[PDB]
Design an enzyme around this catalytic site. Structure first.
Site, PDB file in Angstrom:
ATOM      1  N   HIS A 214      34.751  16.884 -17.173  1.00 57.50           N
ATOM      2  CA  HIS A 214      35.085  17.080 -18.365  1.00 57.50           C
ATOM      3  C   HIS A 214      33.679  17.994 -18.868  1.00 57.50           C
ATOM      4  O   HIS A 214      32.933  18.263 -18.234  1.00 57.50           O
ATOM      5  CB  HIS A 214      35.003  15.756 -19.257  1.00 57.50           C
ATOM      6  CG  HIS A 214      33.741  14.722 -19.103  1.00 57.50           C
ATOM      7  ND1 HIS A 214      33.276  13.867 -18.096  1.00 57.50           N
ATOM      8  CD2 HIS A 214      32.825  14.361 -20.133  1.00 57.50           C
ATOM      9  CE1 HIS A 214      32.198  13.263 -18.267  1.00 57.50           C
ATOM     10  NE2 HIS A 214      32.065  13.475 -19.730  1.00 57.50           N
TER      11      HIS A 214
ATOM     12  N   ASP B  57      26.188  16.267 -17.698  1.00 54.14           N
ATOM     13  CA  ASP B  57      26.194  15.825 -16.562  1.00 54.14           C
ATOM     14  C   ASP B  57      27.311  16.296 -15.750  1.00 54.14           C
ATOM     15  O   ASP B  57      27.500  15.850 -14.419  1.00 54.14           O
ATOM     16  CB  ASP B  57      26.347  14.206 -16.563  1.00 54.14           C
ATOM     17  CG  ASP B  57      27.309  13.414 -17.397  1.00 54.14           C
ATOM     18  OD1 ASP B  57      27.737  13.917 -18.126  1.00 54.14           O
ATOM     19  OD2 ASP B  57      27.562  12.236 -17.014  1.00 54.14           O
TER      20      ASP B  57
ATOM     21  N   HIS C 275      30.779  17.498 -20.687  1.00 56.57           N
ATOM     22  CA  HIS C 275      29.324  17.017 -21.157  1.00 56.57           C
ATOM     23  C   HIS C 275      28.544  17.560 -19.928  1.00 56.57           C
ATOM     24  O   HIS C 275      28.855  18.079 -18.764  1.00 56.57           O
ATOM     25  CB  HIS C 275      29.324  15.612 -20.821  1.00 56.57           C
ATOM     26  CG  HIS C 275      30.024  14.882 -21.915  1.00 56.57           C
ATOM     27  ND1 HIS C 275      30.448  13.733 -22.004  1.00 56.57           N
ATOM     28  CD2 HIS C 275      30.184  15.194 -23.409  1.00 56.57           C
ATOM     29  CE1 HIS C 275      30.917  13.088 -23.401  1.00 56.57           C
ATOM     30  NE2 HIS C 275      30.777  14.278 -23.955  1.00 56.57           N
TER      31      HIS C 275
ATOM     32  N   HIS D 266      37.116   8.605 -22.048  1.00 56.42           N
ATOM     33  CA  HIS D 266      35.585   8.916 -22.379  1.00 56.42           C
ATOM     34  C   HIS D 266      35.622  10.143 -23.183  1.00 56.42           C
ATOM     35  O   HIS D 266      34.694  10.254 -24.091  1.00 56.42           O
ATOM     36  CB  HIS D 266      35.038   9.019 -21.174  1.00 56.42           C
ATOM     37  CG  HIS D 266      33.809   9.501 -21.216  1.00 56.42           C
ATOM     38  ND1 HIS D 266      32.423   8.764 -21.703  1.00 56.42           N
ATOM     39  CD2 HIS D 266      33.054  10.866 -21.009  1.00 56.42           C
ATOM     40  CE1 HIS D 266      31.406   9.602 -21.621  1.00 56.42           C
ATOM     41  NE2 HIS D 266      31.817  10.774 -21.035  1.00 56.42           N
TER      42      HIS D 266
ATOM     43  N   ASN E 237      28.245   5.777 -24.062  1.00 59.20           N
ATOM     44  CA  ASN E 237      28.305   7.023 -25.203  1.00 59.20           C
ATOM     45  C   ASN E 237      29.763   7.115 -25.558  1.00 59.20           C
ATOM     46  O   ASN E 237      30.619   7.663 -24.609  1.00 59.20           O
ATOM     47  CB  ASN E 237      27.502   8.275 -24.748  1.00 59.20           C
ATOM     48  CG  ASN E 237      28.137   9.325 -25.456  1.00 59.20           C
ATOM     49  OD1 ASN E 237      28.402   9.299 -26.674  1.00 59.20           O
ATOM     50  ND2 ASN E 237      28.270  10.485 -24.899  1.00 59.20           N
TER      51      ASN E 237
HETATM   52 ZN   LIG Z   1      30.588  12.299 -20.524  1.00 60.16          ZN
HETATM   53 ZN   LIG Z   2      28.706  10.667 -17.634  1.00 55.79          ZN
END
Ligand SMILES: [Zn+2]
Ligand SMILES: [Zn+2]
Ligand SMILES: [Zn+2]
Length: 231
Positions: free
Chosen positions: A83, A87, A85, A148, A179
């Site tokens: 995804h 990380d 993000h 998520h 989150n």
């Molecule tokens: Zn994420």
């Molecule tokens: Zn994560």
């Protein structure tokens, strides 16, 4: 035993062998004065390696490439981000400069651009509808639906019965929602049920952060999401 924070300082990376030709990679990052771990995957594909996700930042991702060459000694030729993000894509520029071909779905690439994050080069086709799956070298990539994030992918390694859930799956010790600013709380339980229906034979399940387990991690995540929905 599986590595935890106390055993990894930021900037260093550990590898953990799950099965023949399948490893997880573990790194750490500071955020808001706490220290968090993060997982990705490495899968052997003949005499080359496929990487799933960066190690959360440029410095950690350079350390990951150095640890792979020291410990495994085969070239990382392709990488997939699950995804948009940091990380998962933070460190894509380091990978590219090292000659690794970087991949993500068109949805992930668009959301990374809007966020100002690093953007994988290549677009993965065939993953736009919930329930879609495609083979990519030694793994299957699966889009379960929004959870998520709206773009999140999961990865299955059929030779080893390993399911990598990424950040759509929570570890057992996490009892409250993390989150969720980019999450689809209404669809997240339905997306998890699609994973259970498609991979009922999975023997190892790896969350995006924390300790691996079995398929129980799926129902655990649903329980935590539903409790947050009812806040
Ligand atoms: Zn994420
Ligand atoms: Zn994560
Ligand atoms: Zn639970």
């Amino acid at each position: 035993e599986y590595p935890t924070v106390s055993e990894i300082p930021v900037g260093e990376v550990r590898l953990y062998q799950i099965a023949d030709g399948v490893w997880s990679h573990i790194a750490t990052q500071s955020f808001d004065g706490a220290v968090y771990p993060s997982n990705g995957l490495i899968v052997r594909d003949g005499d080359e390696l496929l990487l799933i996700d960066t190690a959360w930042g440029a410095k950690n991702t350079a350390a990951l490439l150095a640890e792979i060459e020291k410990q495994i000694g085969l070239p990382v030729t392709r990488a997939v981000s699950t995804h948009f993000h940091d990380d998962r894509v933070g460190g894509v520029d380091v990978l590219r400069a090292a000659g690794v071909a970087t991949y993500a779905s068109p949805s992930t690439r668009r959301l990374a651009e809007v966020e100002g994050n690093e953007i994988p080069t290549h677009s993965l086709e065939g993953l736009s509808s919930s329930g879609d799956a495609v083979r990519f070298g030694p793994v299957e990539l699966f889009y379960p639906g929004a959870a998520h994030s709206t773009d999140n992918l999961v990865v299955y390694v059929p030779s080893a019965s390993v399911l990598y859930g990424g950040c759509a799956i929570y570890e057992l010790s996490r009892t409250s929602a993390g989150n969720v600013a980019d999450a689809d709380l209404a669809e997240w339980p339905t997306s998890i049920e699609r994973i259970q229906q498609h991979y009922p034979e999975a023997q190892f399940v790896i969350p995006g952060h924390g300790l691996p387990g079995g398929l129980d991690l799926l129902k655990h995540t649903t329980n935590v999401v539903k409790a947050h929905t009812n806040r």
